[PDB]
Every structure is written in structure tokens, then in C-alpha cells.
Design a binder for this molecule. Structure first.
Ligand SMILES: Nc1nc2c(ncn2[C@@H]2O[C@@H]3COP(=O)(O)O[C@H]4[C@@H](O)[C@H](n5cnc6c(=O)[nH]c(N)nc65)O[C@@H]4COP(=O)(O)O[C@H]3[C@H]2O)c(=O)[nH]1
Ligand SMILES: Nc1nc2c(ncn2[C@@H]2O[C@@H]3COP(=O)(O)O[C@H]4[C@@H](O)[C@H](n5cnc6c(=O)[nH]c(N)nc65)O[C@@H]4COP(=O)(O)O[C@H]3[C@H]2O)c(=O)[nH]1
Lengths: 74, 77
């Protein structure tokens, strides 16, 4: 929370100390871990939604075809 | 890879069986999902942009200093 604002008024980084950067880094890292996770998940759910469109209906996908779809070829 | 799944109470919130959705609805869901995907990938970009900037500054001055002793224990067990 305090990370979003301090990073906006801190202007340049030398004004901070190392043990303060370790703090900004920590609270910005996991926010990136879960935003990237949430990203890859919905990105994968899009490849199966688009793949579903071309299989015309209730396409149950064998573990064989899921690999192809998840790479990008839906 | 675990903390994300815990706070991911909204990523699998009201999801539906994609093999049950009708062809018409799939296109309607593709639109909604395509908009959040492009919005989370931007916030992702600007965020990881900060991280690289702050990680560079740290390494520049003090850095990830880890005494060869403690580091050995990390690699050992
Ligand atoms: N449906 C779907 N969409 C996807 C997938 N992966 C990425 N996208 C979306 O489409 C764009 C992908 O561009 P790219 O040609 O992979 O081009 C990417 C890629 O070249 C690079 N990039 C971003 N993150 C990474 C990463 O973690 N690793 C690598 N190697 N390149 C990355 O930055 C470019 C722009 O990324 P963004 O701004 O996020 O823009 C991304 C994102 O909005 C996927 O598997 N499925
Ligand atoms: N072509 C393409 N491939 C993609 C894209 N998004 C993800 N990938 C692939 O999927 C892997 C996992 O990405 P993640 O789970 O978001 O995990 C990512 C993400 O969390 C993070 N990352 C990616 N780019 C940056 C960056 O510029 N700064 C920081 N701090 N982290 C980054 O590190 C991991 C990157 O791992 P990579 O070795 O790049 O490995 C990436 C890359 O191989 C994309 O848009 N386009």
C-alpha cells in the first residue's frame, strides 16, 4: 500500500536507502507473481475458448490435443 | 508459486465449464476475457518495470550481499 505512493514521490532512487529498496522490491514482487499468474491463467483459458469455437460445440479435449492448444495452436 | 494461488480467490471465482458454453456464448466470453488480459498484461509490464529499476539500483550500491557462509547453507540444505 505505502509502496505505491512512496515510489511516486521519491522521485529518484538515491534518496532511498537499501533497506528501504528491499521493502519496495518485496511488496512489488508478489504483486507481480500473482498478476502474472492471473495473466497466464486467463491467457490459457482464452486459448481453450478459441479452440472450442472451431471444434463447434461441446469439444471434450483429449490430453493429446490440450498440449497443442496450450502452446498457442488452438 | 503458492502465495498467488491463495490470493487467487477471484481468478477461479465464478468460472464455468467451457465445454458446456454454446458457440454463441464462447464468442461473447472471448470478448470479455480479451479485454482484461490486455489490461493485466499492461499493469504487469509497468510493475515488473519498476522491479528491474529497483533491483538494478540495489545491485549497483549494496546489492544482494549474502556471506559465502550463509549462501553455502542455502545450497547445502
Ligand atoms: N492469448 C494469449 N495472449 C498472450 C499470450 N502471451 C502473451 N499474450 C498477449 O499478446 C501479447 C504477446 O505478445 P508477444 O508477441 O508474445 O510479445 C510479447 C513478448 O515478446 C514480450 N514479453 C512479455 N512478457 C514476456 C515474458 O515473460 N517472457 C518473454 N520472453 N517475452 C515476454 O513482450 C511482448 C508484449 O507483451 P504484452 O505487452 O504482455 O502483450 C502480450 C499479451 O497481451 C498467450 O499465451 N496467449
Ligand atoms: N513469448 C512470450 N512468452 C511469454 C510471455 N509471457 C510469458 N511467456 C513465457 O512463459 C514463461 C512464464 O512466464 P510467467 O509465468 O509470467 O513468469 C515470468 C514473469 O513472472 C517474470 N518476467 C518476465 N519479464 C519480466 C521483466 O521484464 N521483468 C521482471 N521483473 N520479471 C519479468 O519472469 C518470468 C519470465 O520468465 P521467462 O523466462 O520469460 O518465461 C516465460 C516465457 O517463457 C509473452 O508475452 N510472450
Amino acid at each position: 500500500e505505502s509502496a505505491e505512493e512512496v515510489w511516486g514521490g521519491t522521485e529518484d532512487l538515491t534518496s532511498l536507502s537499501v533497506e528501504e529498496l528491499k521493502g519496495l522490491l518485496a511488496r512489488f514482487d508478489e504483486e507481480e507473481k500473482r498478476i502474472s499468474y492471473r495473466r497466464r491463467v486467463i491467457q490459457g483459458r482464452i486459448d481453450v475458448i478459441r479452440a472450442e469455437i472451431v471444434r463447434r460445440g461441446g469439444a471434450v479435449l483429449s490430453p493429446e490435443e490440450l498440449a497443442r492448444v496450450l502452446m498457442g495452436d488452438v
